[PDB]
Amino acid sequence: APSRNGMILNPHFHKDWQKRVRTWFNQPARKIRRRKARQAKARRIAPRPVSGPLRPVVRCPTIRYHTKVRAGRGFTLEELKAAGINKKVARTIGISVDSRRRNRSTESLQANVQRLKEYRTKLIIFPRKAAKPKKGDSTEEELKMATQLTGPVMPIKKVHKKEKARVISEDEKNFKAFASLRMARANARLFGIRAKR
Amino acid sequence: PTKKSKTRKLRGHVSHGHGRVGKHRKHPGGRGNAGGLHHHRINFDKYHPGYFGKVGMRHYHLKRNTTFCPTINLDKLWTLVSEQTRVNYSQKPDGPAPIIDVVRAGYFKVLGKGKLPKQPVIVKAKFFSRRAEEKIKGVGGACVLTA
Amino acid sequence: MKLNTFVTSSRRKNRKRHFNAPSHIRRKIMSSPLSKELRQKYNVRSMPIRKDDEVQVVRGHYKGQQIGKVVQVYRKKYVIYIERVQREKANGTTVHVGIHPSKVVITRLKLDKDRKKILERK
Amino acid sequence: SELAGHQTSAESWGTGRAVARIPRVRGGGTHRSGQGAFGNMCRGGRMFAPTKTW
RNA sequence: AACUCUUAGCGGUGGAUCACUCGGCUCGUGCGUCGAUGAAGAACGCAGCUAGCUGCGAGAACUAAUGUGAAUUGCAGGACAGAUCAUCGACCUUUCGAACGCACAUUGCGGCCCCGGGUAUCCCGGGGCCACGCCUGUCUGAGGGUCGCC
RNA sequence: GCUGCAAGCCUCGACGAGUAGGAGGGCCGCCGCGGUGGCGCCGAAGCCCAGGGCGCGGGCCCGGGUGGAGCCGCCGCGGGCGCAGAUCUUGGUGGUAGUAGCAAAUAUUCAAACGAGAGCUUUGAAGGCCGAAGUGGAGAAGGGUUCCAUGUGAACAGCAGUUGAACAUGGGUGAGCCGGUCCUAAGGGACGGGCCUACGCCGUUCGGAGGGGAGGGCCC
RNA sequence: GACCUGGGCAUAGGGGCGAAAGACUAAUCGAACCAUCUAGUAGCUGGUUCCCUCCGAAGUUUCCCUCAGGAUAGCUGGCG
RNA sequence: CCGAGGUCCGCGGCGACGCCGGCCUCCCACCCGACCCGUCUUGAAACACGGACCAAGGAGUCCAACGCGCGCGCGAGUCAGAGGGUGGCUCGCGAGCCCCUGCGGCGCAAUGAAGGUGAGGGUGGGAUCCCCCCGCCCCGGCGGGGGGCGCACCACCGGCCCGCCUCGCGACCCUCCGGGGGGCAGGUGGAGUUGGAGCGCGCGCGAUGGCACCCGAAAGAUGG
RNA sequence: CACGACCUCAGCUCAGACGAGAAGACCCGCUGAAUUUAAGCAUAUUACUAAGCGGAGGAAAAGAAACCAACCGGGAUUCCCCCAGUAGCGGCGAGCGAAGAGGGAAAAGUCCAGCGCCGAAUCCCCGCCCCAGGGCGAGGGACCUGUGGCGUACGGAGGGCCGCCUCUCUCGGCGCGGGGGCCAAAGUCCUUCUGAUGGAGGCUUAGCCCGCGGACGGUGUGAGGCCGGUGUCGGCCCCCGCCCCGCCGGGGUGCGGUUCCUCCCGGAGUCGGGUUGUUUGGGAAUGCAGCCCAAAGCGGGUGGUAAACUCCAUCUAAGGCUAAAUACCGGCACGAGACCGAUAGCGGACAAGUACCGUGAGGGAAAGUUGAAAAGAACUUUGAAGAGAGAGUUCAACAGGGCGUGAAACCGUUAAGAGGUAAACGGGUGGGGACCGCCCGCCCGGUGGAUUCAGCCCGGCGGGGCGGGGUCGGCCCGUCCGGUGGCUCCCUUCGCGGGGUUGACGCCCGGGCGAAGG
Ligand SMILES: [Mg+2]
Ligand SMILES: [Mg+2]
Ligand SMILES: [Mg+2]
Ligand SMILES: [Mg+2]
Ligand SMILES: [Mg+2]
Ligand SMILES: [Mg+2]
Ligand SMILES: [Mg+2]
Ligand SMILES: [Mg+2]
Ligand SMILES: [Mg+2]
Ligand SMILES: [Mg+2]
Ligand SMILES: [Mg+2]
Ligand SMILES: [Mg+2]
Ligand SMILES: [Mg+2]
Ligand SMILES: [Mg+2]
Ligand SMILES: [Mg+2]
Ligand SMILES: [Mg+2]
Ligand SMILES: [Mg+2]
Ligand SMILES: [Mg+2]
Ligand SMILES: [Mg+2]
Ligand SMILES: [Mg+2]
Ligand SMILES: [Mg+2]
Ligand SMILES: [Mg+2]
Ligand SMILES: [Mg+2]
Ligand SMILES: [Mg+2]
Ligand SMILES: [Mg+2]
Ligand SMILES: [Mg+2]
Ligand SMILES: [Mg+2]
Ligand SMILES: [Mg+2]
Ligand SMILES: [Mg+2]
Ligand SMILES: [Mg+2]
Ligand SMILES: [Mg+2]
Ligand SMILES: [Mg+2]
Ligand SMILES: [Mg+2]
Ligand SMILES: [Mg+2]
Ligand SMILES: [Mg+2]
Ligand SMILES: [Mg+2]
Ligand SMILES: [Mg+2]
Ligand SMILES: [Mg+2]
Ligand SMILES: [Mg+2]
Ligand SMILES: [Mg+2]
Ligand SMILES: [Mg+2]
Ligand SMILES: [Mg+2]
Ligand SMILES: [Mg+2]
Ligand SMILES: [Mg+2]
Ligand SMILES: [Mg+2]
Ligand SMILES: [Mg+2]
Ligand SMILES: [Mg+2]
Ligand SMILES: [Mg+2]
Ligand SMILES: [Mg+2]
Ligand SMILES: [Mg+2]
Ligand SMILES: [Mg+2]
Ligand SMILES: [Mg+2]
Ligand SMILES: [Mg+2]
Ligand SMILES: [Mg+2]
Ligand SMILES: [Mg+2]
Ligand SMILES: [Mg+2]
Ligand SMILES: [Mg+2]
Ligand SMILES: [Mg+2]
Ligand SMILES: [Mg+2]
Ligand SMILES: [Mg+2]
Numbered sequence A: 001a002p003s004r005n006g007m008i009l010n011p012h013f014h015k016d017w018q019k020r021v022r023t024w025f026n027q028p029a030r031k032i033r034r035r036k037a038r039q040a041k042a043r044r045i046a047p048r049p050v051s052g053p054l055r056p057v058v059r060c061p062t063i064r065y066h067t068k069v070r071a072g073r074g075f076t077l078e079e080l081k082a083a084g085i086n087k088k089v090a091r092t093i094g095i096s097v098d099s100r101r102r103n104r105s106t107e108s109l110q111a112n113v114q115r116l117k118e119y120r121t122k123l124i125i126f127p128r129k130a131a132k133p134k135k136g137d138s139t140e141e142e143l144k145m146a147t148q149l150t151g152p153v154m155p156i157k158k159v160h161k162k163e164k165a166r167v168i169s170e171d172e173k174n175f176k177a178f179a180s181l182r183m184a185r186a187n188a189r190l191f192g193i194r195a196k197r
Numbered sequence B: 001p002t003k004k005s006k007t008r009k010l011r012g013h014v015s016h017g018h019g020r021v022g023k024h025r026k027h028p029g030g031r032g033n034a035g036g037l038h039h040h041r042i043n044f045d046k047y048h049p050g051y052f053g054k055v056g057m058r059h060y061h062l063k064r065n066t067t068f069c070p071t072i073n074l075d076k077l078w079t080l081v082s083e084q085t086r087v088n089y090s091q092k093p094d095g096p097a098p099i100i101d102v103v104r105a106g107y108f109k110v111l112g113k114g115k116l117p118k119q120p121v122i123v124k125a126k127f128f129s130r131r132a133e134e135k136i137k138g139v140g141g142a143c144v145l146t147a
Numbered sequence C: 001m002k003l004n005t006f007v008t009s010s011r012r013k014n015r016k017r018h019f020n021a022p023s024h025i026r027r028k029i030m031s032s033p034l035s036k037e038l039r040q041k042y043n044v045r046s047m048p049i050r051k052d053d054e055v056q057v058v059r060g061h062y063k064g065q066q067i068g069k070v071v072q073v074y075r076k077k078y079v080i081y082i083e084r085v086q087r088e089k090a091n092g093t094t095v096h097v098g099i100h101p102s103k104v105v106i107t108r109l110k111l112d113k114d115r116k117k118i119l120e121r122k
Numbered sequence D: 001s002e003l004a005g006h007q008t009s010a011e012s013w014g015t016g017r018a019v020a021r022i023p024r025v026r027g028g029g030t031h032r033s034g035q036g037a038f039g040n041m042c043r044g045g046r047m048f049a050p051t052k053t054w
Numbered sequence E: 001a002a003c004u005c006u007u008a009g010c011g012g013u014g015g016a017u018c019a020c021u022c023g024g025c026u027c028g029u030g031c032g033u034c035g036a037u038g039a040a041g042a043a044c045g046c047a048g049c050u051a052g053c054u055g056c057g058a059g060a061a062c063u064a065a066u067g068u069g070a071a072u073u074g075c076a077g078g079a080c081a082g083a084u085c086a087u088c089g090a091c092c093u094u095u096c097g098a099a100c101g102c103a104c105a106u107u108g109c110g111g112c113c114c115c116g117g118g119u120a121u122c123c124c125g126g127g128g129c130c131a132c133g134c135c136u137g138u139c140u141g142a143g144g145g146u147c148g149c150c
Numbered sequence F: 001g002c003u004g005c006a007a008g009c010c011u012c013g014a015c016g017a018g019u020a021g022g023a024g025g026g027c028c029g030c031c032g033c034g035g036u037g038g039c040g041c042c043g044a045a046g047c048c049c050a051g052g053g054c055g056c057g058g059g060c061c062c063g064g065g066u067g068g069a070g071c072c073g074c075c076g077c078g079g080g081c082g083c084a085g086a087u088c089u090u091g092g093u094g095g096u097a098g099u100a101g102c103a104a105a106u107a108u109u110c111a112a113a114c115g116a117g118a119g120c121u122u123u124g125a126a127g128g129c130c131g132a133a134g135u136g137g138a139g140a141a142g143g144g145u146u147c148c149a150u151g152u153g154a155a156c157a158g159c160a161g162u163u164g165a166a167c168a169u170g171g172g173u174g175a176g177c178c179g180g181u182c183c184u185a186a187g188g189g190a191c192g193g194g195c196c197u198a199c200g201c202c203g204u205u206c207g208g209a210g211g212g213g214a215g216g217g218c219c220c
Numbered sequence G: 001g002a003c004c005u006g007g008g009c010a011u012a013g014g015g016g017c018g019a020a021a022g023a024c025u026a027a028u029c030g031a032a033c034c035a036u037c038u039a040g041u042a043g044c045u046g047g048u049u050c051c052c053u054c055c056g057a058a059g060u061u062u063c064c065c066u067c068a069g070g071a072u073a074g075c076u077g078g079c080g
Numbered sequence H: 001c002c003g004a005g006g007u008c009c010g011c012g013g014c015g016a017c018g019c020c021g022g023c024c025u026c027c028c029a030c031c032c033g034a035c036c037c038g039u040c041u042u043g044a045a046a047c048a049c050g051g052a053c054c055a056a057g058g059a060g061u062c063c064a065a066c067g068c069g070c071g072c073g074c075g076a077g078u079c080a081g082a083g084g085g086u087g088g089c090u091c092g093c094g095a096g097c098c099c100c101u102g103c104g105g106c107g108c109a110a111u112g113a114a115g116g117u118g119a120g121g122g123u124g125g126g127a128u129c130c131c132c133c134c135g136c137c138c139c140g141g142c143g144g145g146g147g148g149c150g151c152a153c154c155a156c157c158g159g160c161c162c163g164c165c166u167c168g169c170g171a172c173c174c175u176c177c178g179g180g181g182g183g184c185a186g187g188u189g190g191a192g193u194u195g196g197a198g199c200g201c202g203c204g205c206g207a208u209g210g211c212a213c214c215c216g217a218a219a220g221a222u223g224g
Numbered sequence I: 001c002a003c004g005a006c007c008u009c010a011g012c013u014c015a016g017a018c019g020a021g022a023a024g025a026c027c028c029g030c031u032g033a034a035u036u037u038a039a040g041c042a043u044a045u046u047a048c049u050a051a052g053c054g055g056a057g058g059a060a061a062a063g064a065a066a067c068c069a070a071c072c073g074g075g076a077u078u079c080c081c082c083c084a085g086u087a088g089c090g091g092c093g094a095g096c097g098a099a100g101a102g103g104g105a106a107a108a109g110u111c112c113a114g115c116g117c118c119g120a121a122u123c124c125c126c127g128c129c130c131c132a133g134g135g136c137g138a139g140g141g142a143c144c145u146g147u148g149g150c151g152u153a154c155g156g157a158g159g160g161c162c163g164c165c166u167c168u169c170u171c172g173g174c175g176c177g178g179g180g181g182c183c184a185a186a187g188u189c190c191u192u193c194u195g196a197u198g199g200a201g202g203c204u205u206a207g208c209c210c211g212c213g214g215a216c217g218g219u220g221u222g223a224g225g226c227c228g229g230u231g232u233c234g235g236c237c238c239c240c241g242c243c244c245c246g247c248c249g250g251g252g253u254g255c256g257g258u259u260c261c262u263c264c265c266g267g268a269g270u271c272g273g274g275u276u277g278u279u280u281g282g283g284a285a286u287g288c289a290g291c292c293c294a295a296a297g298c299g300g301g302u303g304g305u306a307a308a309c310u311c312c313a314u315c316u317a318a319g320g321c322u323a324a325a326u327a328c329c330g331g332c333a334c335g336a337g338a339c340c341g342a343u344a345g346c347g348g349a350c351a352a353g354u355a356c357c358g359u360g361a362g363g364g365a366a367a368g369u370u371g372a373a374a375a376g377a378a379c380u381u382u383g384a385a386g387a388g389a390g391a392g393u394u395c396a397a398c399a400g401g402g403c404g405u406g407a408a409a410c411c412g413u414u415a416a417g418a419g420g421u422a423a424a425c426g427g428g429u430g431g432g433g434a435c436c437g438c439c440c441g442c443c444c445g446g447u448g449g450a451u452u453c454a455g456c457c458c459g460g461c462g463g464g465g466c467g468g469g470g471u472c473g474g475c476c477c478g479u480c481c482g483g484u485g486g487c488u489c490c491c492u493u494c495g496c497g498g499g500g501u502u503g504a505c506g507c508c509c510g511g512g513c514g515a516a517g518g
Helices: A027-044 A077-081 A106-121 A140-144 A177-189 A191-195 B041-047 B083-088 B130-138 C011-019 C023-029 C036-041 C115-121
Strands: A057-059 A069-071 B071-073 B099-101 B109-111 B122-125 B143-145 C031-033 C046-048 C054-057 C067-074 C079-082 C086-088 C094-096 C104-108
Touching: A057 A106, A077 A106, A177 A191, A177 B130, A177 B143, B109 B122, B109 B130, B130 B143, C031 C104, C036 C104, C046 C115, C054 C079
Parallel strands: B071 B109, B099 B122, B122 B143
Antiparallel strands: A057 A069, C031 C046, C054 C067, C054 C104, C067 C079, C086 C094
């Protein structure tokens, strides 16, 4: 079979693959189908945003996506408590909640509490009955100027803040970056063998 | 397409470009990588040395996000900032130095391959090689570490 | 130009539902235009032909100003038979020749309780 | 169709008969019995390299 | 002469080719609904003239209703000509079949109730029933199984 | 003067075998598509030709005949794109060939009738055979109208046919005491139980609270 | 007579049944038939469809449970 | 005109089909040549196989991935893929257009089993080009003689990076418990480096996995 | 030794329900091969496939963490992309092969048991009363061997304190799409041609006429205007629905905040361990199952290498429910096609799963076309009849019923020629035959007839340019200066959205410049 210099190929076609072949001929048809579902859903929730509830801002786990934020699953119960929002009333006003997530640092906590407060100001709540405007309900002036919000509810901004050009201190120029990492790696390996003393 | 196909010029020729003596049959030497050690050994040893056997330790649950460490050389270090920024601070070499945060650009380690222009620069990376730092220190500037 | 994607434009389908059309649909298919005096009197372009209509052949071998009367509307064969539009057979027997309704022109309508209702809607 | 030409339970008669060693339809009282069924050269058989939808 | 062969015309034999296409194949879309209230499938039967196909079920080539508005057509004949067709919400829907009284290479063999007739008796006909498993409940019971009362 | 489609044109020199195989060119051919340029009842496609031609060739044009409704060039695009072979597939047709053959169980003949038509039907006579372990008379299984009358003589009945188990049109199978039905024979197969992941299987008078009937009038 | 025979029954495929021949088990038996896996695999036979133009071989090397086959080098063509 | 290959400024009989022309093709005849194709084979006209005849059908395909060559776009980038947006009651148009804070793929860094560490020119040949000098000129160039910068590429010699080995081991400012450095040098291993070339699309071909150019087993298995 | 209660277990053609079978493309649970590849072959591969068995639904399954991760942490499930032909598995051979993260589609969460409070506060059956929604019965049961309310890992409950206050469900009545019928523009104008026009030409030179209709089909040929339709969310008519708002009516019952008190907080032959078989990329054992062992409660599971110790992280297993993204070769109803065009395409364009074959499981064809219209050949005549000759229909019988076109093989006949070396074939020619085929141009010299007759002039108009029209003028684009003046600026320094400095930044403005153009 091998004729001359070339790769050792490994085509995984030793099963009965012809019985399981999915052609993407309905791919443009499911785009029309999923689009009609969003439009049909949009009319069913006409005042409410079509994208769903407000999602929090979470940090991607691994080091490969260290500096990357992402729309999370739901707001932590601690983030709702620090924003004055009850657990079981957040779903009624379109706020995503999940109780599995925790806040390991205040940076992630304060980032979503500000996001919750920014949302509640931009939130126009309609009274349960138009003849009875209650306390938490918005005023009759803001109800007329309330349209459906298309796109993600409060998309996450990635502020590309730049460190200002400073003057390099002489103490900063004497910092051995290679020796600092090389000592940190060596001390992290001999840490356990040193604690035995 | 089939217009420029070779089979269109093989009409009329009996063996269809596969010989009369040795006909074109069903796998005359085995299917796939058969005989890689017995009768295709010369081909495997000549063009794929090292194909047979084991080498090195095994890592069962290898997660590529753990060993993720994209690198960048010093010759492409100033590509992370605008060209006007590199020129503006060239006329002001008396302490105002730009900061090139290599982590926010998508790299972790800085390697000292190319030459660096004679400008003080503050380089923020998670890792530095010995020569990358001394070229940054030699040209003026510090190598700030980040996590 | 057809803008309705639910209506077919196909040689295979338009012919199948034409030669297999039900009798009540073949009535609408076997329509014939009205004369310029009837089209001006009733303000109707064409009409589904009936048995006792006076028509006039316009195309074919039997065309002419002779105003005949429909004998029967052979809805199964997509053809009508007129009084004097006929032919002598070999044995001398006279047989009616089939004419398609699209080739005749209704010079006089067979008005009844239902014909005047449809003429009003048109 | 993927089943085009393969709706037959044809077995080759083999050698020993003047027939040409092609899968022939099982016996019966029809014209179809004893006819080539599978190959692309046979009438009513499967075309060479049937056009697949993928 | 004949016979044989070649060539062309013509005529046969044969069916190619071409043109045609109410068919297939493939893709996409919307729905996504069977059955003891008897399904799928099967058998038999049903038309004025009817074998098959198809449609129906002893109301049998269709009933009612609604829409439609003059036909169906091979030949008649006949329309209470609202013809015909479509829709299809009413009604109808033989036997076998999960098929259900027991069976079945049997239109075999039984049982119960009710009705009508001959006359409760029997006989005849008709109607409603009588499979298996299981659930809730009722009813009727069983066992010193555990007690109570004596 | 001519060209100059420069992917064109012109000049000069040498060279030319070829299986397997490779490459190039094709204004070779086929089907469909996007363009473009047309053709057609004053006759398209296809088919036929002792007609006129073109190209090294693949092939092509024209004329004539037939045919009766579609078709083609060019620039691109997409192929189920070209056959002499495969004991190829399907269909058709030859030579063999008016050939082999219509040769198992002794047999037919005369006359007449019907009829367009008779070795073959029918009638009579004659001479023969089966010779009651029939070439006879009735059933079972199986066949399913083959039974019967009449008509037909296309097809079939391997010659014929006025004949038929053919075809066409009608008709025909009548039961308390003939059989089925009733009984269990071998056996099959439920039930209880057990098994089985299950569809189910095992097992057959055993094995369950397996009796649905009483006499006596609420009792055994 | 260890006879012949009908019908009804029983035994079903790696099973049956066999006074035994590998016999018989629906013209099929040293493992029935039917459908499917299955277009099973075949280093083995057979065939592999238009033209012209140009170039043009090898049956030798090494390795191979190889010796009717491959890998490999050589020879070939094309692209430059 | 013995001269850059031919002209006649020579001519005859018949010309309307009787008596003219038609290569090839049709028939026939003669001379020369000439065994039946396909196939396997060292060798086929073979007493080798297949083929009585004719029509129609009939066999290198599609998918995946790879290699190299080529066309194309852009270029240290390249491709937008899933998806989303929308000429708004959606033909042609299940196209096309658009944006995705370009996720990611493949490139831009290799090397080691790994912990890890991680890349600074010379010589020779060299298309092309530059300069000078002497002649000639139709002022645009031509001819002759010299020098030089040297593309790509190749040969060689280096530098550097990672692995390994050997040698050199030292005093010293980064030690801050622990620890990190200490021109190290000389060799050697690497699919490296010393001024990127790739990515996407298309095309062709080759070797593959798939029914895989087509037809073909003796079987084996599952269910009946 | 009966009578009662209970337990356990029976009977019924008891009252009222349920199950069965079909189909099975997609889906769930099992079972399970071998062809095949490894050029043999045994593990492996084929394949956790085919076949076999069971069970569903319009989707199913899955699913709200005994998860991932090791980070600045993610956060149910499903699907897509990528991860990735990667980690890894493998006679480490052939081959096999996921997952976390990331990007997207869709997103919705929750109920018990237990724990302990509430007079079982609960349910069913029967008989009913009012308007599917509410009630009643000194009716019968279920149930304390545990119904209901509260409540479930996000903590929960009760009592204080603080604050705001009661709003769902289901019916009647006025306001905000779907389906089925019916209808809705314009040539049969003129001329010609044809068997038939739907062909050709014309219709002030707006093709004549319509056009939001020039899709498609039918009609005797290529029809926008003959017909059905097509286009117009155009009109009319009849059924029917969703959502929101408002009033009336039957059922609804408050919820939050507490660096305050008190109390409560969990799924056993299960985890785990051993072993066995199988499965997986899971490798000192991924999942599953059998057997054995057999738990704990600051416990248990996991942290991809077996083990002990230790620290950290994460989850809370052994109970239940749950839409939407996803699949769909079956079914129902549609649309489409660079597909096939009667040996093709499904086996089946037709009385096709039909005829027919086999005892049976099963096997399984062949077969489309007269013409526009049957106008399907009256009648005469020969024959017993098929079959003929006439006649007749048709544009056509070179369309006469398996009838459009009618090829090749093969055959009859006619015409022509030939034939003692089987026939054919290459090259050369001959004969014959059948059908065909066949002096002008430029210039000039005279000649004789006609020149809405020539140079030139005048008048009107049009056109032409780097081997070179010249002189004035704008305009467009590129480019460079003049910053001539403020908006983005440079992610540009300063005080806390305002101000100050500069980039070949764009627009504005004047000059340049380019064989850059009109
Ligand atoms: Mg090879
Ligand atoms: Mg060749
Ligand atoms: Mg060959
Ligand atoms: Mg080849
Ligand atoms: Mg060989
Ligand atoms: Mg191959
Ligand atoms: Mg109209
Ligand atoms: Mg033979
Ligand atoms: Mg086929
Ligand atoms: Mg000849
Ligand atoms: Mg002929
Ligand atoms: Mg029934
Ligand atoms: Mg040559
Ligand atoms: Mg094709
Ligand atoms: Mg000829
Ligand atoms: Mg082909
Ligand atoms: Mg052939
Ligand atoms: Mg009869
Ligand atoms: Mg006979
Ligand atoms: Mg008779
Ligand atoms: Mg008889
Ligand atoms: Mg008969
Ligand atoms: Mg017997
Ligand atoms: Mg067997
Ligand atoms: Mg023996
Ligand atoms: Mg094959
Ligand atoms: Mg050989
Ligand atoms: Mg000729
Ligand atoms: Mg051969
Ligand atoms: Mg030999
Ligand atoms: Mg010999
Ligand atoms: Mg032979
Ligand atoms: Mg052919
Ligand atoms: Mg290669
Ligand atoms: Mg990228
Ligand atoms: Mg990759
Ligand atoms: Mg150099
Ligand atoms: Mg085997
Ligand atoms: Mg079922
Ligand atoms: Mg093998
Ligand atoms: Mg092999
Ligand atoms: Mg084997
Ligand atoms: Mg299966
Ligand atoms: Mg269902
Ligand atoms: Mg769904
Ligand atoms: Mg579910
Ligand atoms: Mg596997
Ligand atoms: Mg993931
Ligand atoms: Mg939970
Ligand atoms: Mg039309
Ligand atoms: Mg396995
Ligand atoms: Mg570990
Ligand atoms: Mg569930
Ligand atoms: Mg067919
Ligand atoms: Mg079908
Ligand atoms: Mg004709
Ligand atoms: Mg004809
Ligand atoms: Mg014909
Ligand atoms: Mg002839
Ligand atoms: Mg002759």
